[PDB]
Design a protein around this ligand. Structure first.
Ligand SMILES: [Zn+2]
Ligand SMILES: [Zn+2]
Lengths: 215, 215
């Protein structure tokens, strides 16, 4: 509900802000894209850039000169092939950047799906989780279990049959396992933030899993 | 605009019918799924089964009984993992079934994307086209060039933002190439039938390609 230039900031819990920037598409209206600012001590961890370089620079300005909690680290969870101007702001601000390769720092995951190594240490208290199984190429997801917050990719909206046909024609079982793993990784999270959509409760999870076994 | 049991048939051109059947989803209503019946001489070629075995048996009965153009071959373009019962009806009627592996008859494609071998011969005048590139795993598409008809997967709707975030977080460039390849394969087709959506004109293609560049 707090506006700072093109960026819109929303508090999900004490010490956790969601940031939302919009992309105008001819004939589709403005399209949200979400991220997190995660306060840790006197610094923040940024989860995802905005659409553009200048939008991302604004978030970095906001953390440093409104929150007095400057960004000391960033993690990518849902990159965009052309809209990667946001990487330049972080590279110019000497903000250490993490992303799952398969960003100068690679996040590796263990066979349980949890991030390991320096990456897990540097981004705590965020818990980075990779939900996919063999042959998958999912985006990573992140959670704050103690606050009941999980952050993942776009799920089926209530009442919207728009993406149902794509779901039936894809690897429904693989998609379903990914959603099941994510659900079980953050089993107590009742706020499910989304990459390009506002948060929902766990009804969103259950709704997607019903569809996968119904088609 | 002609109804037979659970199946609904629409004539796209002389000798070409689209068949539509519905799947009731709790909270989402009925979801269409489309295929084609393609008259060739005194027989028909069936493109895709319906949702259910019993709906598919209705389709073979219609061809044999109303059209008197009995189904002599079938090709799969968008299989469903759980709704595989429609294959049982085909194998019971001793209908030869063709499908692209990556249905005991495999369709192979050449480096131009066109089907080859006995498959192309047996399914003519359907032209079978594989639209993807390296590392892709697209569904096949089919066209009747002389009739200006092409049949593909589900595409973005006008004004519909539901799928937009999923599109930015996928391999937009790979998706875009597939749509461009499909467009160039049937460049004169003005009727684009869809796997789970009513037909549109070429505006559907251009709209999808416009998004992929802006994402
Ligand atoms: Zn995204
Ligand atoms: Zn389908």
């Amino acid at each position: 509900i707090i506006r700072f230039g093109e960026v819109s900031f929303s508090q999900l819990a004490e010490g956790v802000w969601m940031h939302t920037t919009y992309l105008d598409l001819m004939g589709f209206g403005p399209i949200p894209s979400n991220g997190l600012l995660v306060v840790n001590g006197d610094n923040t961890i940024l989860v995802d850039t905005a659409w553009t370089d200048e939008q991302t620079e604004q978030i970095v300005a906001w953390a440093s000169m409104v929150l007095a909690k400057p960004v000391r680290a960033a993690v990518v969870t849902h990159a965009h092939q052309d809209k990667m101007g946001g990487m330049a702001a972080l590279h110019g601000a000497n903000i250490a950047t993490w992303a799952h390769p398969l960003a100068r720092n690679a996040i590796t995951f263990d066979a349980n799906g949890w991030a390991t190594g320096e990456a897990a240490q540097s981004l705590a208290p965020l818990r980075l989780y990779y939900p996919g199984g063999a042959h998958t190429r999912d985006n990573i997801t992140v959670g704050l279990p103690e606050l009941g917050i999980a952050f993942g990719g776009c799920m089926i909206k209530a009442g919207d049959a728009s993406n149902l046909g794509n779901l039936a024609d894809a690897d429904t079982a693989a998609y379903a396992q990914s959603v099941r793993n994510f659900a079980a990784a953050f089993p107590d999270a009742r706020t499910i933030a989304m990459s390009h959509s506002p948060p929902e409760g766990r009804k969103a999870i259950e709704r997607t899993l019903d569809l996968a076994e119904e088609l």
